[PDB]
Amino acid sequence: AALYTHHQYIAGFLMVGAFAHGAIFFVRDYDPVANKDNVLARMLEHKEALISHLSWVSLFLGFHTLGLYVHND
Amino acid sequence: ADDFANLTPCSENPAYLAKSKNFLNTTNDPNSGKIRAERYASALCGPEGYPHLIVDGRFTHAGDFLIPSILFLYIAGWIGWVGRSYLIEIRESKNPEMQEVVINVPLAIKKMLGGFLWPLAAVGEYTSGKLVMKDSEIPTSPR
Amino acid sequence: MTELSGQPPKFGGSTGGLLSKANREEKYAITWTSASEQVFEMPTGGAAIMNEGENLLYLARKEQCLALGTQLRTKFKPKIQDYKIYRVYPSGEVQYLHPADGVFPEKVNEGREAQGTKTRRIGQNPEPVTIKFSGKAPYEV
Amino acid sequence: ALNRGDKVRIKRTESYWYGDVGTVASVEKSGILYPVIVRFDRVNYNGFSGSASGVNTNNFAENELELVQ
Amino acid sequence: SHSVKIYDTCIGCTQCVRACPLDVLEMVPWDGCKAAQIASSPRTEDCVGCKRCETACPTDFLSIRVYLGAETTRSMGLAY
Amino acid sequence: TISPPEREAKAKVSVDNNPVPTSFEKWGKPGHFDRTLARGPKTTTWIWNLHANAHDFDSQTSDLEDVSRKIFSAHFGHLAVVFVWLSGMYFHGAKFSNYEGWLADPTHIKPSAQVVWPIVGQGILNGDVGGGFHGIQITSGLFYLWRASGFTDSYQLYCTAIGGLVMAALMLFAGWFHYHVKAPKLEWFQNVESMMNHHLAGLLGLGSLGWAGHQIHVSMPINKLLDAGVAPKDIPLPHEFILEPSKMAELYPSFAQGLTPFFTLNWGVYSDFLTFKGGLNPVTGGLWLSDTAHHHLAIAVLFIIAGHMYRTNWGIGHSMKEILEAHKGPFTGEGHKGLYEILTTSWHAQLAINLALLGSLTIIVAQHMYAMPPYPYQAIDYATQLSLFTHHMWIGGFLIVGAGAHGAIFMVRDYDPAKNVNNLLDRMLRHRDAIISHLNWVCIFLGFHSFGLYIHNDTMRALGRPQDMFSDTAIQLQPIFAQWVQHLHTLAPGATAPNALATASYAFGGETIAVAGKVAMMPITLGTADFMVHHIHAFTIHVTALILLKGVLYARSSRLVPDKANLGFRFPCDGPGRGGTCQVSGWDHVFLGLFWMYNSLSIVIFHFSWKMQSDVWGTVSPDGSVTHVTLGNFAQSAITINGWLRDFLWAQAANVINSYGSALSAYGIMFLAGHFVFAFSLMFLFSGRGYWQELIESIVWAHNKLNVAPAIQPRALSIIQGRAVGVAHYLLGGIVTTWAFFLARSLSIG
Amino acid sequence: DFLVHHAIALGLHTTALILIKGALDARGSKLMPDKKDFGYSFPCDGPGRGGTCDISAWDAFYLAMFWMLNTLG
Amino acid sequence: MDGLKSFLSTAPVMIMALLTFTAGILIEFNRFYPDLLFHP
Numbered sequence A: 001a002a003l004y005t006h007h008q009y010i011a012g013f014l015m016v017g018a019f020a021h022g023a024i025f026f027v028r029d030y031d032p033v034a035n036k037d038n039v040l041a042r043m044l045e046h047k048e049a050l051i052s053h054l055s056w057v058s059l060f061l062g063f064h065t066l067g068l069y070v071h072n073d
Numbered sequence B: 001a002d003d004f005a006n007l008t009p010c011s012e013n014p015a016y017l018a019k020s021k022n023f024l025n026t027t028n029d030p031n032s033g034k035i036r037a038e039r040y041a042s043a044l045c046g047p048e049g050y051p052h053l054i055v056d057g058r059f060t061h062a063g064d065f066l067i068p069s070i071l072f073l074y075i076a077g078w079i080g081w082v083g084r085s086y087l088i089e090i091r092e093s094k095n096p097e098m099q100e101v102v103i104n105v106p107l108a109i110k111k112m113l114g115g116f117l118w119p120l121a122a123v124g125e126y127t128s129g130k131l132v133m134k135d136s137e138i139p140t141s142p143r
Numbered sequence C: 001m002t003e004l005s006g007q008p009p010k011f012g013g014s015t016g017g018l019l020s021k022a023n024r025e026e027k028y029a030i031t032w033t034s035a036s037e038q039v040f041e042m043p044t045g046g047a048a049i050m051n052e053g054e055n056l057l058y059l060a061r062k063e064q065c066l067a068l069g070t071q072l073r074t075k076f077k078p079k080i081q082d083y084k085i086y087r088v089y090p091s092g093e094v095q096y097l098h099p100a101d102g103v104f105p106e107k108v109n110e111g112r113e114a115q116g117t118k119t120r121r122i123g124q125n126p127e128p129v130t131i132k133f134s135g136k137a138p139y140e141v
Numbered sequence D: 001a002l003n004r005g006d007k008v009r010i011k012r013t014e015s016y017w018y019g020d021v022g023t024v025a026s027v028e029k030s031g032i033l034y035p036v037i038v039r040f041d042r043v044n045y046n047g048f049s050g051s052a053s054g055v056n057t058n059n060f061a062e063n064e065l066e067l068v069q
Numbered sequence E: 001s002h003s004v005k006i007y008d009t010c011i012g013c014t015q016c017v018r019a020c021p022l023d024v025l026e027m028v029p030w031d032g033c034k035a036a037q038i039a040s041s042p043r044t045e046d047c048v049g050c051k052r053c054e055t056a057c058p059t060d061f062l063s064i065r066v067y068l069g070a071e072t073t074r075s076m077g078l079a080y
Numbered sequence F: 001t002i003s004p005p006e007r008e009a010k011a012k013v014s015v016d017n018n019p020v021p022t023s024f025e026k027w028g029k030p031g032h033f034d035r036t037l038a039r040g041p042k043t044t045t046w047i048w049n050l051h052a053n054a055h056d057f058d059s060q061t062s063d064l065e066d067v068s069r070k071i072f073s074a075h076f077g078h079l080a081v082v083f084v085w086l087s088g089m090y091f092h093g094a095k096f097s098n099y100e101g102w103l104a105d106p107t108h109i110k111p112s113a114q115v116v117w118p119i120v121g122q123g124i125l126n127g128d129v130g131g132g133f134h135g136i137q138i139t140s141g142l143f144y145l146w147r148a149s150g151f152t153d154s155y156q157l158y159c160t161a162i163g164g165l166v167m168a169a170l171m172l173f174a175g176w177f178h179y180h181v182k183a184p185k186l187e188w189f190q191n192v193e194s195m196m197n198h199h200l201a202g203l204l205g206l207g208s209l210g211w212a213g214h215q216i217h218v219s220m221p222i223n224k225l226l227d228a229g230v231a232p233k234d235i236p237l238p239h240e241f242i243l244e245p246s247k248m249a250e251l252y253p254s255f256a257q258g259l260t261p262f263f264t265l266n267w268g269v270y271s272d273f274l275t276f277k278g279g280l281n282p283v284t285g286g287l288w289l290s291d292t293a294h295h296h297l298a299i300a301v302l303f304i305i306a307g308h309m310y311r312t313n314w315g316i317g318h319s320m321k322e323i324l325e326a327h328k329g330p331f332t333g334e335g336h337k338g339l340y341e342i343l344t345t346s347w348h349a350q351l352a353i354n355l356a357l358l359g360s361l362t363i364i365v366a367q368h369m370y371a372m373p374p375y376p377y378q379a380i381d382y383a384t385q386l387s388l389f390t391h392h393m394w395i396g397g398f399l400i401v402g403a404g405a406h407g408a409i410f411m412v413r414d415y416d417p418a419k420n421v422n423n424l425l426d427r428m429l430r431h432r433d434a435i436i437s438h439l440n441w442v443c444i445f446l447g448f449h450s451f452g453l454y455i456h457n458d459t460m461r462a463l464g465r466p467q468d469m470f471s472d473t474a475i476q477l478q479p480i481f482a483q484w485v486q487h488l489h490t491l492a493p494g495a496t497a498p499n500a501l502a503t504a505s506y507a508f509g510g511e512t513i514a515v516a517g518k519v520a521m522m523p524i525t526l527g528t529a530d531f532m533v534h535h536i537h538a539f540t541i542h543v544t545a546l547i548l549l550k551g552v553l554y555a556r557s558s559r560l561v562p563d564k565a566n567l568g569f570r571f572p573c574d575g576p577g578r579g580g581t582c583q584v585s586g587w588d589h590v591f592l593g594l595f596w597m598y599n600s601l602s603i604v605i606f607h608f609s610w611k612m613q614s615d616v617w618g619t620v621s622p623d624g625s626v627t628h629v630t631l632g633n634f635a636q637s638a639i640t641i642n643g644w645l646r647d648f649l650w651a652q653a654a655n656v657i658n659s660y661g662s663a664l665s666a667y668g669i670m671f672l673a674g675h676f677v678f679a680f681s682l683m684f685l686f687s688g689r690g691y692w693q694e695l696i697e698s699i700v701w702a703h704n705k706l707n708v709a710p711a712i713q714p715r716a717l718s719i720i721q722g723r724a725v726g727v728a729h730y731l732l733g734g735i736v737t738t739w740a741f742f743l744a745r746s747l748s749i750g
Numbered sequence G: 001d002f003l004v005h006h007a008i009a010l011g012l013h014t015t016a017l018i019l020i021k022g023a024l025d026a027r028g029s030k031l032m033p034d035k036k037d038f039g040y041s042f043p044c045d046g047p048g049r050g051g052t053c054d055i056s057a058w059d060a061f062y063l064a065m066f067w068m069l070n071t072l073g
Numbered sequence H: 001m002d003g004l005k006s007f008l009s010t011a012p013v014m015i016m017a018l019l020t021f022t023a024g025i026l027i028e029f030n031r032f033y034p035d036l037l038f039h040p
Ligand code: CLA
Pocket: A055, A058, A059, A060, A061, A062, A063, A066, F676, F677, F678, F679, F680, F681, F682, F683, F684, F686, F687, G010, G014, G017, G018, G063, G064, G066, G067
């Protein structure tokens, strides 16, 4: 029971780190002329849609999962 | 084949048949407990005595998920479509925000009563090009 | 500058004034002339009575002096626009601060140099990938 | 080549209305970097915390715009 | 000390100087706007960074920018 | 509007004939009271700022004569609201309760005054309280009040509700009248001497006078029969006592003499119903009503006499201006000079006193009702006792922080430095740092020497070292002063109170009164576990006072911000500069003090709830022994944090989680629901709006993609509003959790 | 298991949403189009423009840490 | 007069009237036909 939870918390810090360093890549190392029109810059070109659909799916989850739990209670 | 072998119908389930004789009454009708005993006895049950619902898409349980899914989606599309059309209708009247704060009841009701055909209206706005917008015409943030 | 002439305001002393570091490191003084004897609020706390004519008061930092200056001209009908703020050193060195060139920094004035002026837009700043490993920022270049 | 009442789309990137379309109010004479004053139907962010709205007008340049109408 | 810059989008309305509480900002005659003036920051040594200037800017996004830096006794707003 | 004659007789009455006309066009215009909001909503924040400033009349108009006329009608409307609510309770007692079914056998049935509509399974919430009635067992203690007032039939409660609705209509009408027909001038208001005379002699004096008359003619002669064993249907009506004054003359020997002895200074003869027995009633477990009538008569005489100290129109009397200008010593210079003018002009200055005193008095009400139970059978109803106590704790706790809010409001909005030149307020503003730093030191001291004791006890009991603990069986911390005053109050009837027969309360020491099978009140032995928790309470209150005091002594300015008075009362900050100027306003200080008031009362109510269940409440044996609920472990287990975590929380929370399937299931539901709202508040309290506005940007792009964006541009909550929603949900979730837990626990102890 | 798996899916989608909006909008936005000039971690931008608390790409990491901990709980 | 007809048609009054109406609909439907975990 201890080893599993240990490794899961380890990985839960590792993923947040993977994202925190990508933000730092965008802040310090992203070159918009070097990566022009590539698959990386198109991610920035449609970032509103990515964030919007992430919010939609998180709402679509949270709403019904919480509603079903409260309904069962 | 023998799909859901670990699940037995409520008509055969042990714990469910034990608990169904002792069902509480929700409304004022004293038969409501026995009404549930007779009503839920058709669904599949588990070894604990509680009904289970299968939503994998099979038509045997289309009453479990398919009917509420369709009924919701209908009513929700109705809501969203009349809201969107009324929001567009406001954009040509005096003060586009005041009429969003103070509701034009003779207009909101007129748009609500014409929402039972929202799929046809939406397809007619998509073919003509009114449903969606163009990316080159929407305010976006610096990349 | 040469001399800091002025009468200390009528005040029964407070704990919000200057301290030991404020006397040893640096303190600030403000000189102004009052048309009459009236009551004004202390930027450190309480209400004091300014003397008629030239006044003098020492404060801890500069923002306190400027907060009193912005109060003097706005609350009283005989507005005080001649308040002069000086920075005092531990060696008696007193220099002029506010107003700078005799005129308030609000309205424009002839004889000032463009400091921090850029010839671009904020959306025209260079990319941080072009200046990394150099001791310069996208706004410093 | 603009007049009072023209629909133009902002192309100032960092602008709050970059991509939105506003109405030209008045254009000032030569000798100004941003003489084209444009009004908008939507306020920006400007204002202290808790303000009711913002500013719906700004000055731009001709190379930063695109007529629509 | 903090860094204060003023961009060519400034219309010279003196609002950022009317809001500055430490006499950090001034106004110099310019040739870009109708008012023919632009904001100036000669006394950056007295800038605490309370952003009272940026709050009082009218142009589409700021024309004056404040970038916080190496904090000192004067920038920290220390009165003791 | 209408036009009455004049209604005056050589008075200071001064009104304006129809200042504000009556119309409905301003109803369809939201936010019209504010100039900044009348131009129409341009962002969604415009909506929030509409409610955030709905009652702030200073930002609306600057004329004080208009603000006072608004406040008067606002009070009238509040009184209408209150009368509506009270008629609700009387009507639910008349037609949706079992007050008659409870009055018969009060020791074998539970109070209930609500019936749940049987639908979608919620009909299970109707618990069998006894006697065939099914409903929610109430804890507000309305049946005890209605028994102590003489209510015996449902028609009485019905007529009470009707009268309450009539009074609600009257207050609602008077509000409109005093703002749309004849609104009073300033000449009618600023008579604080006259207003104090009228509020003492007429309101608080004649009120207790008339209520004592009621008790002597209604409450006492009917409760005397109720406590004897007479059926309510055989007990006569209150007006049959005045229609036949002989029936009253006989039921009390003093009444058998007439009215003349009272006028001829023969008070001692009325000792047959104006008694001074004290203690409690062995039949009901509450205070003696014969003592309460005498008490209300005494309070009435005292208040009517007090209403004749200040000067009005006939020359005699005092002027508070004179009294304030007279008090001045060598320590404070001019003393109270200018304070009359402070409290006769600034409404916030008055509210910062009234709220403080009203909250303190509500706390006193709780602390006095719990130990000297004044209502019949309320000391046996542990649920009702706990509920009244904690509810009157929370009301006062909120009303106290209101004072620290409105004081800072007065400082920023109404403090004129020219009007305060070397008096109490001005000189207090000088040495702000002295008081604040000294209170800082005191709070640190009380934190180390009250909570560190609990930490040390937990570490000692964890290390297996019993002889090193602060307990009643080791390094004892006995409270000598409290035990001494307990013993003083015990020996009162035979020394410093010869006329008193019993002690004020049996909590100090004495006999153990018990009704039916449960105990009413017994001596509360105070030991180490009481000393430590009392010091915990003192520490938490000290920190709350420090916060709410620095909120007022620095709302004007500080070494950090010297121009803070310009920024107003409610503002988030003054930029990230100066290292960080976040949360410096008085509004932010009240936002912080709310949490500490909650944290202090959280330990206060837990101290009450565990000490009562452990060293007071419990079943009494027919031989005489008393066995407490938690077996008296408070003096031996409440000394460690693990004791409160296990034997208090974990042990007594079992009633709430195991409540599913019963009539108490709603309490478990609300327990989890408060656990939900608590955590929901943390999202606001830990984040900042700069992220939420950037997210709203993406959602706005998504809406404009389908061309569904509202013209009201969506804007995240302001920083202040973010903090406000955070603290509101924090308090709501916590108080709902504790309410559900306390009610489910108190209802499950028999 | 189904309901707890959907709660887990919510915990993943929302944490990733926060960590992705922090990385994408790390160079700029419509509140701060010059976020790239302020670096990765910075306090804010001031109370103006409605408010700028927790606006840096570092603050998004700080917020998503709570969601990672909740998902791992 | 129209001043009150505009107040009865404001956002909060209407958004509470619709919620009350929908509550009535749902409550009466689950009164006459309760316990509908799925469709028969
Ligand atoms: C129990 C506490 C709690 C709750 C309920 C939430 C809930 C939410 N967080 Mg959140 N969060 C929390 C704590 C919490 N957080 C904490 C402590 C932090 C660290 C500061 C964060 C940091 C955080 C970030 C950074 C983000 C979120 C986001 C979200 C939203 C994701 C959408 C969703 O889940 O779908 C559905 C929504 C729900 C399940 C919650 C709604 C529940 C109500 C009861 C539904 C019914 C409405 C109700 C009837 C209204 C009427 C009220 C009336 C009585 C007055 C969601 C509403 C993300 C977001 O904004 O989404 C895009 C986002 O990026 N959170």
